[PDB]
């Protein structure tokens, strides 16, 4: 009746031994957690990274949020003190109760009531921003003299600043600018402030740490049910699925998990409390809302497990004409070019993705040759700004190769869309390529030698 809470997601309590290596741990729990999309991780009792900041010197500009189910939202001044004051007063006035006396079950039930009720027009605010000088990480960073306890946590794998640049991580090696994706984001929550249903760019993992405050309530869907969920959403809110002009225009929405459950989409929930992690797995849809004033920090990451999904994601973006954050192939080749310093399991996994890449590229080049494209010239795609190497048709970021024509200077298509460049005959076209097939096989060989 009204709201039936989804079943709880898995909760893990690793020993210090298990916890010592986050990537080994994530790999370990993967068979369980990828069935539920999200999971919660409680660190050992004494793993307690110190949080310290001046609530008066940290400033941010809040986003305003209307709370209407199925309404389109875009994904995209307070001090921490004055936001907290606003947040606490809002919640206490809303329920006419002290804040720690409002039950989490009640806040959840009320959230789904208010987003579905037309006559209510509750609006709330929240902070979402990457770490900057005006507002930095909640974890200790090297810089100001740190206490020994802060020094304990400087190099932790679970310190979310480190997570991207570890050796079992793959986003580490990207030299391209992907700041929105490799740097942690900070989130200052208040009662009912929410994150709409979404998956991460390039189907990456994410990991979210609640530094302090009241809980964050999550709903998650396993990766295998992603298209099921999108089909439900497409039927109920087709506006969200119209083509978008860029990455800064992704449309997202609030939707009751019971609606998904009614359509046989599996959904799991959890209340993430202060000091706990939530991990989301590749292509795992998630959404949720904050129970009260709180402070979270999150970052994307990519393991070796993710590599073939990353390749699939970019193919999916092509089919949808969605812009890429980076070139997957460019990342693969960057890693190949550094094969000698790669971790060995990483090298082994990159090698396998590269073999697919090369075999696909071979077939694509054979096809465009048969279309009458004869002329060719090497081109260092990685030097071009992204907006100068997107396929005219499908918007993919080109790297392995593209087609150009003197008739349309500066315009490019990927090898899937040779017909979409211009009206000139194909003998006027050039194949622009980063590597010959003969360049590529030795690069893959280096990875093989490293992997042994
Ligand atoms: O998607 C996540 O990691 C959760 C999120 O944005 C938030 O805490 O507002
Ligand atoms: Cl409403
Ligand atoms: Mn997310
Ligand atoms: Zn294309």
Swiss-Prot record:
Query: In which residues is Fe cation bound?
Result: 198, 200, 286
The entry's note on the tissues where this protein occurs is: Ubiquitously expressed, with highest levels in testis. Down-regulated in melanoma and glioblastoma. Up-regulated in breast cancer (at protein level).
Disulphide bridges: none
Domain JmjC spans what residues? 152-318
Query: Which parts of the sequence are C5HC2 zinc fingers?
Result: 391-443
Q: Which residues bind 2-oxoglutarate?
A: 126, 206, 208, 216
Cellular compartment(s): Nucleus
User: Signal peptide: which range, if any?
Assistant: none
Q: Where is the JmjN domain?
A: 9-50
Give the protein's function.
Histone demethylase that demethylates 'Lys-4' of histone H3, thereby playing a central role in histone code. Does not demethylate histone H3 'Lys-9' or H3 'Lys-27'. Demethylates trimethylated, dimethylated and monomethylated H3 'Lys-4'. Acts as a transcriptional corepressor for FOXG1B and PAX9. Favors the proliferation of breast cancer cells by repressing tumor suppressor genes such as BRCA1 and HOXA5. In contrast, may act as a tumor suppressor for melanoma. Represses the CLOCK-BMAL1 heterodimer-mediated transcriptional activation of the core clock component PER2.
Q: Which disease is it linked to?
A: Intellectual developmental disorder, autosomal recessive 65: A disorder characterized by significantly below average general intellectual functioning associated with impairments in adaptive behavior and manifested during the developmental period. MRT65 patients have moderate to severe intellectual disability, developmental delay, and facial dysmorphism. Camptodactyly is present in some patients.
Tell me how this protein assembles.
Interacts with FOXG1B, PAX9, MYC, MYCN and RB1. Interacts with HDAC1, HDAC4, HDAC5 and HDAC7. Interacts (via PHD-type 1 zinc finger) with histone H3 unmodified at 'Lys-4'; the interaction is inhibited when histone H3 is methylated at 'Arg-2' or 'Lys-4'.
What family is reported? Belongs to the JARID1 histone demethylase family.
Domain comment in the entry: Both the JmjC domain and the JmjN domain are required for enzymatic activity. However ARID and PHD-type 1 domain are not required for activity per se but contributed to recognition of the H3(1-21)K4me2 substrate peptide.
Protein name from the UniProt record: Lysine-specific demethylase 5B
The opening ranks of the lineage are: Eukaryota, Metazoa, Chordata, Craniata, Vertebrata
């Amino acid at each position: 009746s009204m709201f039936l809470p989804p079943p709880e997601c898995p909760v893990f309590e690793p020993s210090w031994e298990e916890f010592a290596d986050p990537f080994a741990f994530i790999h370990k729990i993967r068979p369980i957690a990828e069935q539920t999309g999200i999971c919660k991780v409680r660190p050992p009792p004494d793993w307690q990274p110190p949080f310290a900041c001046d609530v008066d010197k940290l400033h941010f500009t809040p986003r305003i949020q209307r709370l209407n189910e199925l309404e389109a939202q875009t994904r995209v001044d307070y001090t921490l003190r004055t936001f907290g004051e606003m947040a606490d007063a809002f919640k206490s006035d809303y329920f006419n109760m002290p804040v720690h006396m409002v039950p989490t079950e009640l806040v959840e039930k009320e959230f789904w009531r208010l987003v579905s009720t037309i006559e209510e027009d509750v609006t709330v605010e929240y902070g979402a921003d990457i770490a900057s000088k005006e507002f930095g990480s909640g974890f200790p960073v090297r810089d100001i003299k740190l206490s020994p306890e802060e020094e304990e946590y400087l190099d932790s794998g679970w310190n979310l600043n480190n997570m991207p640049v570890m050796e079992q991580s793959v986003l580490a090696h990207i030299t391209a600018d992907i700041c929105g994706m490799k740097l942690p984001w900070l989130y200052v929550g208040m009662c009912f402030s929410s994150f709409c249903w979404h998956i991460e760019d390039h189907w990456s993992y994410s990991i979210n740490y609640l530094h302090w405050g009241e809980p964050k309530t999550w709903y998650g869907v396993p990766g295998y049910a992603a298209e099921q969920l999108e089909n439900v959403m497409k039927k109920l809110a087709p506006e969200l699925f119209v083509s978008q002009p860029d990455l800064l225009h992704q449309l997202v929405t609030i939707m009751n998990p019971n609606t998904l459950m009614t359509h046989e989409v599996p959904v799991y929930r959890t209340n993430q409390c202060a000091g706990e992690f939530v991990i989301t797995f590749p292509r795992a849809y998630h959404s949720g809302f904050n129970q009260g004033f709180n402070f979270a920090e999150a970052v994307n990451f990519c393991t070796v497990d993710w590599l073939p999904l990353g390749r699939q994601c970019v193919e999916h973006y092509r089919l949808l004409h969605r812009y890429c954050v980076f070139s997957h192939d460019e990342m693969i080749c960057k890693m190949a070019s550094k094969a000698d310093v790669l971790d060995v399991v990483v090298a082994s996994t990159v090698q396998k993705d590269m073999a697919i890449m090369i075999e696909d590229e071979k077939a694509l080049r054979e096809t465009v040759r048969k279309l009458g494209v004869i002329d060719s010239e090497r081109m260092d795609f990685e030097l071009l700004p992204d907006d100068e190497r997107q396929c005219v048709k499908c918007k993919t970021t080109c790297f392995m190769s593209a087609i150009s024509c003197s008739c349309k200077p500066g315009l490019l298509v990927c090898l899937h869309h040779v017909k979409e460049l211009c009206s000139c005959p194909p003998y006027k076209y050039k194949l622009r390529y980063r590597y010959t097939l003969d360049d590529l096989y030795p690069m893959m060989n280096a990875l093989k030698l490293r992997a042994e």
